[PDB]
Design a binder for this molecule. Structure first.
Ligand SMILES: [Zn+2]
Ligand SMILES: [Zn+2]
Ligand SMILES: [Zn+2]
Length: 178
């Protein structure tokens, strides 16, 4: 096994996957690393199994059909993995915890949103369709773009949204386009 957490790249109290060499902090893994279960298989492993059991699941899909899917177990897992892929980027620190807004010339968003809020919402099964999760994710970056206006800090939202969008297209096998 690796000696650092796959998500945050730090050592510490790590739980090791039994079917691959990755390791995790307890609350870095999504869902949080399960109490018992020997062997234990990480989310990366669980996602790879879905693909292996249904190879046709990798054929191209339309985003509109993906968004309308109900949050059954496999779509729940995919959203958890997508969320975790965002946390994997160190720039996710800016979007993790609850923001506050007091900048001359700007007004805060009407609906603040942040990664840990999305994490809780997934844990509490608050999304009934993929669309709910994707909307909240995209709202994080849209709120950031609007608030920071012409400040160069707006670029952090572009950057992390790009990681989100690339991973969304990969995990949900969105049809490739020009
Ligand atoms: Zn970690
Ligand atoms: Zn694994
Ligand atoms: Zn099949």
């Amino acid at each position: 096994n690796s000696n650092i957490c796959e998500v945050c790249n730090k050592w510490g109290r790590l739980f090791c996957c039994d079917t691959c060499p990755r390791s995790f902090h307890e609350h870095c893994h999504i869902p949080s690393v399960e109490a018992n279960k020997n062997p234990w298989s990480c989310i990366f492993c669980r996602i790879k199994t879905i693909q292996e059991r249904c190879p046709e699941s990798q054929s191209g899909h339309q985003e509109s059909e993906v968004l309308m899917r109900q949050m059954l177990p496999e779509e729940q897992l995919k959203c958890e993995f997508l969320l975790l892929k965002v946390y994997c980027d160190s720039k996710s620190c800016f979007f993790a915890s609850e923001p506050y807004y007091n900048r001359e010339g700007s007004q805060g968003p009407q609906k603040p949103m942040w990664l840990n809020k999305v994490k809780t919402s997934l844990n509490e099964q608050m999304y009934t369709r993929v669309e709910g999760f994707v909307q909240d994710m995209r709202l994080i970056f849209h709120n950031h773009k609007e608030f920071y206006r012409e400040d160069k800090f707006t670029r952090l939202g572009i950057q992390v949204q790009d990681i989100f969008e690339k991973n969304f297209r990969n995990i949900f096998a969105i049809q490739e386009t020009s």
